[PDB]
Amino acid sequence: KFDIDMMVSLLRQENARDICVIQVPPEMRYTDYFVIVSGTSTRHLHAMAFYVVKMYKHLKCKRDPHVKIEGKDTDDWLCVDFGSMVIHLMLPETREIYELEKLWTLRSYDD
């Protein structure tokens, strides 16, 4: 079955430098788990996306719709969204430019 645990273990075992997962309350709309992770080079981020969708495809979700990788044309920010958890691979620079963690922990205002 799918849960944040296995994908986080995937990322850590894949040697992804930084991980930060924020759980979104159901009072919001988008999702439940919202993950921001880093990587070395654009090809390494592409590899992380590769492996994550590979396991998501060979594990389960024959009932559930398939998941596309969004951002391939870009090089410094890639992202995936699943039925209930969404992941954002980012180079450290753009990751610290879009101060996402502050937003997803402090929804009620802007930064």
Binding site: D18, I19, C20, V21, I22, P25, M28, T105, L106
Partner: protein, 69 residues
């Protein structure tokens, strides 16, 4: 200047100690971000925004709008 010169200390203590109890995120980068959350803006600024920034720190601690796990 702040709502209370010692309240920030308690907030920082609670932030660090609750961050000790993470299950997924790395503790190192969480600690670094927590350091940044006060270091870059909560030094010598005016006495008006102090209330708002203490409020945002404390509501991040509360976490009715997402708990960092």
């Amino acid at each position: 200047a702040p709502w209370s010169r010692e309240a920030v200390l308690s907030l920082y203590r609670a932030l660090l100690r609750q961050g000790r109890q993470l299950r997924y995120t790395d503790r190192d980068f969480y600690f670094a971000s927590i350091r940044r959350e006060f270091r870059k803006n909560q030094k010598l600024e005016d006495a008006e925004a102090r209330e708002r920034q203490l409020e945002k720190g404390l509501v991040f601690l509360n976490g009715k709008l997402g708990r960092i796990i």
